[PDB]
Design a protein around this ligand. Structure first.
Ligand SMILES: CC(=O)Nc1nnc(S(N)(=O)=O)s1
Ligand SMILES: CC(=O)Nc1nnc(S(N)(=O)=O)s1
Ligand SMILES: CC(=O)Nc1nnc(S(N)(=O)=O)s1
Ligand SMILES: CC(=O)Nc1nnc(S(N)(=O)=O)s1
Ligand SMILES: [Cl-]
Ligand SMILES: [Cl-]
Ligand SMILES: [Cl-]
Ligand SMILES: [Cl-]
Ligand SMILES: [Cl-]
Ligand SMILES: [Cl-]
Ligand SMILES: [Cl-]
Ligand SMILES: [Cl-]
Ligand SMILES: [Zn+2]
Ligand SMILES: [Zn+2]
Ligand SMILES: [Zn+2]
Ligand SMILES: [Zn+2]
Lengths: 225, 225, 225, 225
């Protein structure tokens, strides 16, 4: 795939024109992220998303578009009665999803694959408040330059990054970076978690730019709540 | 666009290869029709779909892939608080959608567009029982050869083709013929209506072939019920 | 308690005056049975009612107000996460509950107690159709006179009397015979099962009178569906 | 009816013994208030409760068991498609209802009657925060002694006491003071509003005692959410 970014000639509005591989950015009708209007969402009998994570975080990488924690892939969540294995988690500032037209300052994405390669992403909003103890373990060894990897000696428990309340919005969408492939299950937790002002500012300093894709039209979709 | 059909080298498994315009048949992850597994569908607080149809049928046409009644476009349904205007209705045998893995013998589609060109299709299943009086009005003047159009001798009341019970399944999908464009709202009524064996046989005889696209994978979607 | 019946001076409209013990018949605001208006019922995320019955039917008794099959009490259903043990099942003609103002010709009640004596009744509607094979085992030895008991040599499987579809209406109500105690959980299956005309007529012949309490006002209650 | 209170020999555990008129306190199985366990509540397709209140407050009264604002009865809410007219509102500290086993410091009740005398009570929880401007209008003229009534100097807009978010819990229950009559519709708003510590302390000082009835067992009921 061709080089892409968050501004200039290779920014989100141009992604669909950068490569034939990125065509869904241009033609897709089921794209992510979205604004979640809570009144427009349909109240629904959604199943609990059960979490069976393990502490198998291997390293943290700065890949030039996010900070990503890479996992061994043994932990999983249960969605639609199937195991989706946690491969990695990573971060955006400001939030990619909005709620009633408003951003949160930060959003984490936990990226899972089932045995057939189907993708489920769990989304967690963060607000500025108390220092997040689990996040601090990652932040302490944040790779400051693109291309850098840092081994984790501290034991990261990814379950501790999720909100205590597990209510969520669900919809069918896409990856938020090229090639923006569709057929992705989105589980967006309603309750935000806290990070310190200092934690937010370090991420923003290291990144050096905002890394959220603009919200995309719902089209025929409904969000369930 | 390129010629297509329901069998052989131009059949549904090949549509995505017949024309670059038909790419979504090949790469789409939100395609129609689908199997509706009722246990897998999510019980949800779905709004009533209000129907405000008018008797403005213009003609009936045999277009080589279905029998279609063309409307004036003044009647409408309300979905997501918006007016979707009835442009035409047409027929498939056997059914395109299945329920718990089983076909109905016949399925009608009512095709609507809102003021911005967004598409909603209402689907009505038919089972063999008593002769359908409203269907008979169209069947009496059925154009027997592809390319033929006939004037309607009786007044068509399209709402009389809908089931009395208005409970429905809803999902986001596509058109079921090339180019199989996505972003289509599907409203599939749960209760079937009746047609006579003779009515079904006249349709199958005039058509000369099955005209249902095979069901497509749900992928990330849920059906609401 | 005082003598009561289904007609005359001791009939349902007088039950509240027959004994101080029967006061809830007169003053209760949460009485059973009720008319279930399906449009007025609230669509709700009701849990499956899991059935763990055993074949421990002991005898059938004609107690002068119904025909009742008495169980050993080992089988149970799960409601609100608790085990409610099946103590007995018995019958009414015509139905006690109505649906949209209409009776079924027959209704069975499966009466359960949890470990603290809380009552749950499962209601099954019957319509006239094919002979019911499981019911026939009981009907073959139906005690014809009040006061008579008949031992069951045939092995009754009460699960086979429930509908195959397990969707239900739920509401909070009362026993339908004096003392009409409240705090009773009602689970009324939506789908009826069949019995033969002959089976219905034998029950009605043996009883000699209709044994349904008139429907009672919903008052502050909602039915969930 | 017999004299009753919130403590000692005339307290809530004894109400059912103080008068034959108070029998439901003792024998009722659908009593209020209750603990609302949010996980045990059933997610349901509840209709919005529309509010059409008017500024028709007549006076405020200290009646020896609460502070009550008496209304003209022209304002109303719509529940089950019917108009329930606002007759009065009053206050309890600590809260009568609990949520997940915890009290709020304060609870308001808006008491409504339909044209046939059926009762609906709307409940609003308060937490300590900023001074409540609408509450202050009443608090400024609070009658300090039982039996005293005061005219209202400012115009009372009762809708301004309701939370902005109108999501609610619903159940069927009773009045929370003798005779504790059943058949009462309860609408308990999920979102609390704020009052100052000083506002709460003035209420507790004037009252001289806690005025909440203990929570009552749910028995057969479910709470909808
Ligand atoms: C390799 C990989 O994981 N790609 C992703 N692209 N976007 C993602 S997101 N922001 O939708 O979670 S994950
Ligand atoms: C011109 C037009 O309406 N095209 C359609 N193609 N498929 C349709 S369907 N079967 O999805 O309703 S409508
Ligand atoms: C002893 C016993 O079971 N009493 C009952 N009275 N009414 C019942 S019913 N019709 O409500 O199931 S059960
Ligand atoms: C006269 C009158 O309204 N009596 C009430 N008793 N309890 C009520 S409450 N706390 O249930 O709202 S209202
Ligand atoms: Cl990523
Ligand atoms: Cl480390
Ligand atoms: Cl068509
Ligand atoms: Cl019409
Ligand atoms: Cl009985
Ligand atoms: Cl036998
Ligand atoms: Cl009061
Ligand atoms: Cl007001
Ligand atoms: Zn992401
Ligand atoms: Zn069609
Ligand atoms: Zn019974
Ligand atoms: Zn009160």
């Amino acid at each position: 795939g061709a080089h892409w970014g968050y501004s200039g000639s290779i920014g989100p509005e141009h992604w669909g024109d950068l490569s034939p591989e990125y065509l869904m950015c241009k033609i897709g009708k089921n794209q992510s992220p979205i604004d979640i209007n809570s009144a427009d969402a349909v109240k629904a009998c959604l199943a609990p998303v059960s979490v069976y994570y393990v502490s198998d975080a291997k390293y943290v990488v700065n890949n030039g578009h996010t900070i990503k924690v890479v996992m061994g892939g043994r932990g999983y969540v249960v969605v639609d009665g199937k195991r989706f294995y946690l491969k990695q988690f990573h971060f955006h500032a400001p939030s990619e999803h909005t709620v009633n037209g408003k951003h949160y300052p930060f959003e984490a994405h936990f990226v899972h694959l089932d045995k057939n390669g189907n993708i489920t992403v769990l989304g967690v909003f963060f607000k500025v408040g108390k220092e997040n103890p689990e996040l601090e373990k990652v932040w302490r060894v944040m790779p400051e330059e693109p291309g850098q990897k840092r081994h984790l000696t501290a034991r990261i428990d990814p379950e501790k990054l999720l909100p205590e309340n597990r209510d969520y919005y669900r919809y069918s969408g896409s990856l938020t970076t090229p090639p923006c492939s569709e057929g992705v299950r989105w589980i967006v937790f309603k309750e935000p978690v806290e990070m310190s002002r200092e934690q937010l500012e370090k991420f923003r300093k290291v990144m050096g730019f905002d890394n959220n894709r603009p919200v995309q039209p719902l089209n025929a979709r409904k969000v369930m709540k």
